[PDB]
Amino acid sequence: SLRNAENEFTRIQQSINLWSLRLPSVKSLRELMLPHMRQQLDELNVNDPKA
Amino acid sequence: TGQLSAEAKAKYGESISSFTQYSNTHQEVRGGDGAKAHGVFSGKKEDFQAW
């Protein structure tokens, strides 16, 4: 009788990083938002939770 | 006058082999640019110089 077994596994990870973008969360940021998005936000009838 | 011959023979063999290899490597680079930084993982001097 003969029994012969092999197992093999590899894992590789590679990562590259390049520049990060940050946004300061100042109050004037609302003025930079797209107008159709802005009116969509402030037309939200928050009296309806489903909305 | 009678003749008898008897023989018994037995042989047994067992053999076991095991092999195990494990490798781990971790590399990290900061600064330069990330694309050249990935080049140092070649381990090749010109790419290290390029970083």
Distance between the termini of chain A: 72 Å
Give the biggest sheet of chain A.
none
Largest interface, Cβ cutoff 8 Å: A-B, 4 and 6 residues
Instruction: Give the helix/strand class of chain A.
Output: mainly alpha
What proportion of the residues of chain A form beta strands (DSSP E)? under 5%
Helical proportion of chain A?
A: 10-25%
Coarse shape of chain A:
elongated
Roughly how many Å is the radius of gyration of chain A?
27 Å
Order of helices and strands of chain A: HH
State the oligomer. Answer: part of a larger assembly
Number of helices of chain A: 2
Structure description:
- This is part of a larger assembly, with two copies of chain A (about 50 residues).
- Chain A has two helices and no strands.
- Chain A is an all-alpha fold and about 50 residues long.
- The interface of A and B includes residues 14, 16, 17 and 18 of A.
- The PDB classes it as toxin.
